[PDB]
Design an enzyme around this catalytic site. Sequence first.
Site, mmCIF file in Angstrom:
data_model
loop_
_atom_site.group_PDB
_atom_site.id
_atom_site.type_symbol
_atom_site.label_atom_id
_atom_site.label_comp_id
_atom_site.label_asym_id
_atom_site.label_seq_id
_atom_site.Cartn_x
_atom_site.Cartn_y
_atom_site.Cartn_z
ATOM 1 N N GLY B 28 -4.014 -5.811 3.762
ATOM 2 C CA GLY B 28 -4.322 -7.194 4.032
ATOM 3 C C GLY B 28 -3.419 -8.221 3.386
ATOM 4 N N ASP B 53 7.852 -9.665 5.484
ATOM 5 C CA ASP B 53 7.390 -8.417 6.070
ATOM 6 C C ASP B 53 8.251 -8.088 7.287
ATOM 7 O OD1 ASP B 53 5.933 -6.180 6.767
ATOM 8 O OD2 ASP B 53 4.143 -7.274 7.391
#
Lengths: 327, 327
Positions: B28, B53
């Site tokens: 998460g 990311d």
Amino acid sequence: LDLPDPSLKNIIDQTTLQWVFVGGKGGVGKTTTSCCLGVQLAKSRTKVLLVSTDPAHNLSDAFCQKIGREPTPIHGFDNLCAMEIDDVFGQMFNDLQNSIPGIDEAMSFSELMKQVQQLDFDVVVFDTAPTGHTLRLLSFPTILEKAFAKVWELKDRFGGLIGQATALMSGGNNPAAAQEQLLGKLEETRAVINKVNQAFQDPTKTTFVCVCIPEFLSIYETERLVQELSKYGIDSHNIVVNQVLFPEKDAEELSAWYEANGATLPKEAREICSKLLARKRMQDKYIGQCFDLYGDDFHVVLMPLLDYEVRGVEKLKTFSELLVDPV
Amino acid sequence: DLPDPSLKNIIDQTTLQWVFVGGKGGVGKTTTSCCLGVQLAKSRTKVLLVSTDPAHNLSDAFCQKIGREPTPIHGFDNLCAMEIDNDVFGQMFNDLQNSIPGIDEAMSFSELMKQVQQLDFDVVVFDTAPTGHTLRLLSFPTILEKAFAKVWELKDRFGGLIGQATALMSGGNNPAAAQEQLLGKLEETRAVINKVNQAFQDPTKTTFVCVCIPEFLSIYETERLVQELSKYGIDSHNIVVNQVLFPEKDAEELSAWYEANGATLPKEAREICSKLLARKRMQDKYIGQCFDLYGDDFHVVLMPLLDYEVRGVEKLKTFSELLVDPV
């Protein structure tokens, strides 16, 4: 002058060779020279294998034939094969890969060496990647030692958490069993690479061929590669200066002829002769630099620049003759 | 007595300029980063979200296409998001990349940090890559120093050859000028990263939020990341344990009810209750491990596991409300 023969015939003469590496910068003709060396070794040797670690698939375009990731017999040869190469345990392995860059390359090279040594061939030619990646290929042992020390450091530092969690998870996720399996994989890889390097440091079995062209960058990378091979005890005694402009005539003979018959030529022929002579002078300067750096201990093989790409089996067979015994 | 189980200290510390969110993949990180951005958009004048990311998870999180440059978040007045993807100089740069793995990532991070510091925002939330790549991100200064030392070593060793070739080639292809240009690029990158790292070691401006799940691997990566942040002088005092099964009841109540009425349930209800009880026991063990490792110095925020994926602005608002002021 008396100097070693300007040909790669010494490679064919030394029948005890088992690993023939061909290195150099990209675009100097590594793939072509490697294929020609393989074609020439296919005559005297019982079985010859070519292995390409160059990321691209240049072997297929060179031989004009689809070459697979496994040995694929070369069309027109009976004994010449080619090959082109591109959960707690899993998490710790990913941590090791991220912490130690180059360990994955080391394990891939170990697996490749095991497969090649189990394929059972008499001699393997090795079209390596450009010089930069070959230098890491040579520095692999330090990377393996850093991986071992990183695993040991992680174990020591996080032993508290690892033991406290070992009590919790069951079955095949024990941090200690997985960590020992990671250590065992590192040990397998290190032993394979150690045996391979022991075989590599024997000039009886392993030699290196450096391919270059008469330009600054190519000679600079060739010197880098030679110095690194010297540091790591790998033998090299063959420098191939490829794409040489007119390897027969001198800059002096034709320079004098042109200075004697300059005003007798049309504008176009005169410009073409001047450009060709200038490029020939530059190439001669760089070849003299090569003969300064080497020549005493290296066979310097000059190869002529051709108009056509040296592709196809017959053209490669004809070019190999220019490679192993010149005019 | 324990610190408040919420990230409200992040909103309270008005001097924060860099809020990094790290952790293992799938715990998460993106959700927590987006919720922190939504919450900071209330107190701060301008808030920026930066995603390093590799995937494009920010677009799926916000249910909206987010561009490579700041894209104002739909429905917010001060929240922007962003997702981030011969030649002698080129040859020397490639030699540096091959000798020093990670220098290209360092230069890319330097460019990103310069761009973000020139965008002028009050607070930037940083959805980092998985833990290993953030650990690589932390060693950038040492990598830049090693790159400098490699360039200087090459200069010292091959100065003769470099000057001898400088004598030859003309215009903008001087190997010595190219080496000095590489040194200047390294100096630019090192100065940018030095300013950024000086900003990182200031708890006034930079803090780290560690996201994990009640499993061994996530807690292990969280411990690795916390120890690395401690070694490199980066402050972290917030652990977010996400996807917690039933954060309200203790391990006892439903287990006692089931053990009193175990044989009275149909096969399906009994199977689901047994699986749920096992998952809850494992999660409680790992949460106790978390409270053993931290809690003394860290705000431990427990987040409930939901049936739906936390996508869309409303789900993000509700998860942020559970994040900064829990039940």
